């Protein structure tokens, strides 16, 4: 039996940024949800639609794991119907979203003295993002009525900003690793099943 590789998802060396969030497809394997209960400190383990107790006896076609790292205070922004910088410009979940959200502390791996600037988010944008939309554009944002000519200056800004994670921060400003499990089953034969 080929057990599904949730290990290479949760136990990765590095995660993805918020504006470029990583997506992994898993299928053609048997999935056990007891192993996922390892890594005892869980900041949040919340599921919508199906229940975690009844998750073991279910079948789907494919599963999609979306992984990234955010600030602690931003965790509550990874739920349906949430508003914020992360939920408006970086990562969006639909209102009818059915799936599981797992957020756990990562202060011991993703925090460096002097600033861990590898994690970035989007601050400015012309409009909001639609559900499951990823934007990696790097165009200059215009806040006035004069062409910027592709150079920053007065009323012309750079959209992407960077987190400064350090170990001495507070719990709310500490990095947190977030993984979202979305289950997709189709009218085709189901493939993802448990024991």
């Amino acid at each position, epitope marked *: 039996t080929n057990l599904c590789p949730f290990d290479e998802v949760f136990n990765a060396t590095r995660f993805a940024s918020v504006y470029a969030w*990583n*997506r992994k497809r898993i299928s*053609n394997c048997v999935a056990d949800y007891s192993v996922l209960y390892n890594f005892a400190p869980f900041f949040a383990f919340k599921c919508y639609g199906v229940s975690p107790t009844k998750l073991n006896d279910l079948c789907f076609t494919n599963v999609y794991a979306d992984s990234f790292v955010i600030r602690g205070n931003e965790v509550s922004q990874i739920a349906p119907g949430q508003t914020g910088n992360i939920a408006d410009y970086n990562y969006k979940l639909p209102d009818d979203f059915t799936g599981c959200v797992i957020a756990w502390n990562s202060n011991k791996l993703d925090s460096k003295v002097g600033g861990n600037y590898n994690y970035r988010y989007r601050l400015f944008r012309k409009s909001n993002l*639609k559900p*499951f*939309e990823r934007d990696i554009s790097t165009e200059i944002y215009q806040a006035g009525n004069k062409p910027c000519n592709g150079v920053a200056g007065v009323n012309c800004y750079f959209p992407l900003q960077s987190y400064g994670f350090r170990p001495t921060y507070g719990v709310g400003h500490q990095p947190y690793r977030v993984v979202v499990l979305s289950f997709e089953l*189709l*009218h*085709a034969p189901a493939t993802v099943c448990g024991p």
Partner: antibody
Amino acid sequence: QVQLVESGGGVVQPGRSLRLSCAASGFTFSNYGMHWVRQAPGKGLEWVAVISHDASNKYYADSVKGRFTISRDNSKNTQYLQMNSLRAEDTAVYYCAKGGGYSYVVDMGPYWGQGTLVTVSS
Amino acid sequence: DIQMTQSPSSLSASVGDRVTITCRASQSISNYLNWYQQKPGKAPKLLIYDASNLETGVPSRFSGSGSGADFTFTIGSLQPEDSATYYCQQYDNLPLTFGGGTKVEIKG
């Protein structure tokens, strides 16, 4: 049992219009989003257009910019493409491909149609 | 945009050999590459998805490998039923770009 069927191809004189349709069965067509790709006779594949799930984000190729229009018909399980100002080298076989759900417009793979063939000659 | 090159453009192998294909990229695309098989007059069929993962209803002889920019595809015990054209495609960003292709002739 997911099936994609393309239709509307044929012969058209240069400088006219033509509409292609892709009919889908076996999934909730209203919230997935779709792609149009084409292959010239004796050449490789060439991506043409993509449309999101609702019908609010549309993306096109530069070589077909200003003449092609992608539309959805969420209800009829059909996706439509409109072609205008057709020129000499637009003869090809067109496939419609299933994408990733919601506004994930960079997904495609194991669900293709059989293709419909379009020529532009006098 | 994104430019990707397939090599070799043509390959010939005997019935009991091993065939390897290469596909490059002009930037880092991570595990966002997939391979297609196309017989003459038929739609492409997905063989390897997400940078070396196997799909349903495929022999175990088909195996991928790669990350970053350069990717490799490999076949195991070759069989007479493996004459087609193989394509690599990226799905990292805007307009999705295919490759030139590789035509495989079985020499007997």
